[PDB]
Design a protein around this ligand. Sequence first.
Ligand code: SF4
Ligand code: SF4
Ligand code: SF4
Lengths: 156, 176, 70, 303, 171, 96, 90, 209, 74
Amino acid sequence: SRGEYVVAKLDDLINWARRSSLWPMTFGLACCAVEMMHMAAPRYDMDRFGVVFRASPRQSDVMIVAGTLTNKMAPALRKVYDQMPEPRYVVSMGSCANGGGYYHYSYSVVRGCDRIVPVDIYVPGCPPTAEALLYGILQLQKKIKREKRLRIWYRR
Amino acid sequence: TYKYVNLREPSMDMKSVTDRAAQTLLWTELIRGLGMTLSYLFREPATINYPFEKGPLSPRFRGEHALRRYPSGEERCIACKLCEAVCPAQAITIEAEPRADGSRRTTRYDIDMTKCIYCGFCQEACPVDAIVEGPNFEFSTETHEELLYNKEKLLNNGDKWEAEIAANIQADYLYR
Amino acid sequence: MWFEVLPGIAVMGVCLFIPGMATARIHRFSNGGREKRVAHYSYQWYLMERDRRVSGVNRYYVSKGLENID
Amino acid sequence: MFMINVLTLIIPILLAVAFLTLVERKVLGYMQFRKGPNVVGPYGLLQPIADAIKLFIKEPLRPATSSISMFILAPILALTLALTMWIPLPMPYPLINMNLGVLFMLAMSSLAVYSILWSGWASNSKYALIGALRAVAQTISYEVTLAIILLSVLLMNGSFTLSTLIITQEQVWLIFPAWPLAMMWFISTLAETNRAPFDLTAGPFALFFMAEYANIIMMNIFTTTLFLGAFHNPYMPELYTINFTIKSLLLSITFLWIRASYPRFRYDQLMHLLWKNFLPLTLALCMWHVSLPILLSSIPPQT
Amino acid sequence: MMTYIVFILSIIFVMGFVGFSSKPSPIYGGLGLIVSGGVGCGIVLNFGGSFLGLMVFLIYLGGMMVVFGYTTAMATEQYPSNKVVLGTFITGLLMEFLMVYYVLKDKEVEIVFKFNGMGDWVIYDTGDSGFFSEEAMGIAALYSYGTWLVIVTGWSLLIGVVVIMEITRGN
Amino acid sequence: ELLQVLKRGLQQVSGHGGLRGYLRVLFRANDVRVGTLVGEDKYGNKYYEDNKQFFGRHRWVIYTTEMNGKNTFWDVDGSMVPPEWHRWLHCMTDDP
Amino acid sequence: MNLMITLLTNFTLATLLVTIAFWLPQPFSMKFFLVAITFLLFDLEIALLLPLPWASQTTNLNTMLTMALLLIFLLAVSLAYEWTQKGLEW
Amino acid sequence: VLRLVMELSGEMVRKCDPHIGLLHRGTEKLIEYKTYLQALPYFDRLDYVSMMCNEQAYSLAVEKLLNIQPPPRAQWIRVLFGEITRLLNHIMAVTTHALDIGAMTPFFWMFEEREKMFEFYERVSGARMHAAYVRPGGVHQDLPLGLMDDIYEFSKNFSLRIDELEEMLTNNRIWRNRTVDIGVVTAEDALNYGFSGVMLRGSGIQWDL
Amino acid sequence: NVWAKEPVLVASFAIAGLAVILPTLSPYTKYSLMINRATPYNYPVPLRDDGNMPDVPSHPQDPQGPSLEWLKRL
Ligand code: SF4
Ligand code: SF4
Ligand code: SF4
């Protein structure tokens, strides 16, 4: 099946192209923002993995929900999420974001962020030490490596 | 005792004012800033090659939430609920039953890794040091179900290694 | 160090080297080892037009050297 | 052979721009303590190939614009200026020997001002219009100054032909008869290409990005041609091509290196700076370069 | 790619003038005037053609429609085709093709003139030794003999500056 | 002082064993500082400890292929190291 | 028409780039206006100034020196006038 | 992230209301429904860039109410980590000022310095940032052997690096011309509007707690 | 006195004043006029022989007419 061979190789090529750079947007409310800045630090690079910190939600590949999400914040967070280009992926960073965390039993704190957006990679820690976030971004890249998108477009 | 900045006056000697005007017209200390930045260009970069060179740590890092057990023996925990009492996030959830041996034991021992703020109070509150903040910090969980650990996930997490945790506790059983 | 930024600089400089060498090679190649004659002013253009007229082949670069005096 | 010249001039500009993106990212990385991109392949070249092809793959935001034909018409104009605007610039023998090309350079920069204005109109609502309007104003603020300085630096050269320039810069570089005029010119080239220290704070961002970096390489090529250049020996021009490319590379690195380490300007500080500091001094350098060659008895041999 | 190319560019020039004489939105008017000025530049460069069309390209197509689009941005909005604009465009194209056909398949069509209908390679120089592309040294003579002219020109522009600041709230 | 670093820069290449073997660790991720070879390890992988570099480039692992049978020539992971090498690798000690 | 050939090739290759990029994935202020007409009038006086390097070769040089200095001095008078009369301030 | 609503005459102002409360977390009520030692990390992480002076203040609150003086070695170690936290918070204030103003690279230089300070926090308490570590009633679990030499080496190297930061910025002409003209603070308004800390140190009157 | 407040203004006025005044004092503007005059763009048209002219030499080698010799001596 030379057509299936071509579709498999071309899907491998375009999924490599997708997982190559993956420039995020740094949403970053509380101290998890400081830790995102500290994995933007000179010791732990991001440019080695093609990752560039960038304040442009009009072109951002993945979105890193980090910090304590509140009721006064969450419509603005999803309104940022909605003006995002449709191939989109979500990293929930931090105990506050991945299930409520320390301010769980509390008004004006959304219990997690599944109540707002879907989540692809949970990375726990408080703050998740930058090596753990970087391993989470590697597992996100390998999630992009396992997609079989064009194969499903073939055999659909 | 104090030391305050910016109390002088620009001089009235012609040499000093023409040096300041030369700085104004001739972009001088801008070029000196370029020289400083090129002096940091020619250093060697202090980046660690991440998946091959992992970062430095401590003997007392607070990580993985792995239980321990006795030397050639059974489970170390008691279900005495001190960790659940001290847990500030209240992520510990314990249900105890005793077994046929007579000694008191458990049934259910759940840690909400979503809620866990990683303090060390359950490490320092266990009178037998059963629950230990583990060594490594590599969780990276796809689903939301998998961040809710059972007693068996904690015991397999503590039987995939103890010699690491035993080495850490044998290193620093004297401070705490 | 900057020993490894020099492959990127070298590859981008080779990507800047190709139009100069290609342009000069095609100018020396399109007239048989000559150079493409320039014409800013109409004097040089009339000179070039009578040059391409006298050579017979209707191409100016040949330029009929001294073999048709008498 | 003419379309072959066209292809060899306008095909490698995409490779030039993408490898310029990796060059400037690695240069900023070593200005910082960073390596990278070096994990993706050998020293990160297929990584700019890959993010270019990813941004072509990645699905556009649906308009949500107005006058879709005008939204087509602006970036096509920017990129066709960036394509058409390497023609008379001599790598040793230029593509079209013109009677006058530098006024054509400045006019094409003015067309780039048009493209920025049309993208800012056709993009979105009012705040994008105000921001792009201030960007058009701080781009248009300098085609006074850069054209004035161009006029002053080639008044010592007589003709607009630019080959008389590549001749008459053989003895000394023209950086020496005008160092402050050239330095103010280089500041105005930073203003034309619109990078830091000159602020900015949509689609296709790839084509906007492409037009900007080809504009950068164009202005640095014209910088190297306009001010310096070694001796041209015919029947071996690869020497001049190599030395030209080396000095254009060094000045592009210096350009990004000046970007690397300074804060952005306040907008009214930028206008105040340009008018009340550059513009009387450019006029004074114009009038002194008028009054000089009548005193050195050397008007240029204007052919 | 043939002989009557100045004529063809003249026809596209009239196309552009009709295209924004149909009274569109003024940004479409500015677009049409840029197209018309570009092809007028093409015409005057085809008549040889050194300096003047490259000179108008900087001013109108370099610094006048920029200010027109700038003022269209700051003053008007035109926030959302019509039968009037499209009807005027069709009648203008009708006038265009009517004149072109009745000239091309005849001798002449006259408002009051005598238009010899053929291509305008005529008239031109017979390849003389011009040596300086006459317009170049022509406008070079604007400073030697031009005593009164640049004085009143600069004085008019200086007064234009003080006019603009006074009307836009001097001082 | 120009050719010597260019001569020393060949010594880790020709000392590595060859050209394609050097190309394998270059295209794996980065490392070209081969030559100490402190610890081999069950499930294949190797551990290299150097002192000539700064704190952070003392100890680096190089993974082998098929340590679970999963074709790990590409896409190397964290937690592919056994735990005693996880104590040694994070510089919690000086003893291998 | 050979630079028209170059223009056509650049325009057509750019339209190929745009169509592959699109069909494969599927109030105001007064102070803005002073800068506009300021650019306009000074750019017109630049349009006067720029044929000066055409003109350096003539047998009447004193008048050309005098009137060229007169033109730039008038441009300086206009700039200094709007400078002293708070024209571009904030 | 803050909300700001500014009503402005153009490239100017009339009013400016900072709408904030977006990052509200119920901290006071949550401390009311817990004990002291359980609810200590609330005061550790309500302020988050400073991370040990907040703990020092809450520990001094509970000690000043409870009438217990800590032993003096705990006091001197608490002084050392208070000065580390002061150094860290001022250098982050400088660098996030620089990054929001432009000025890309000294941010990264001083965050290399702050990465070394997080290494010091790791070797002392174990966690990256949020060292609880200051119990009310004295400091818990003192520092391991082999640390003071590291702190001394860091002190020398950071003296040289802060001198090189002052080389980089600070008599840079255009950063000065960016921020000199703006933001005066009247001393009458400095006392009425309740400013504190660096505002009181800068706006005239001599005042250090 | 003013050199501290607006220095670029004073530098511009100084170089402008010398660009106006400095072309007066010159041993070189006469050389400018001679070199700019002595460049033949047009053809030197001859003239009819005898209105009894004891000047204007016929062979262009004859130095009777005003030649140029200040050129080659700079
Ligand atoms: S998860 Fe922890 S580190 Fe992150 S925002 Fe919450 S308190 Fe801060
Ligand atoms: S404190 Fe220790 S022994 Fe008690 S319930 Fe918790 S883990 Fe078990
Ligand atoms: S580290 Fe803290 S939050 Fe986590 S289980 Fe232990 S006491 Fe509870």
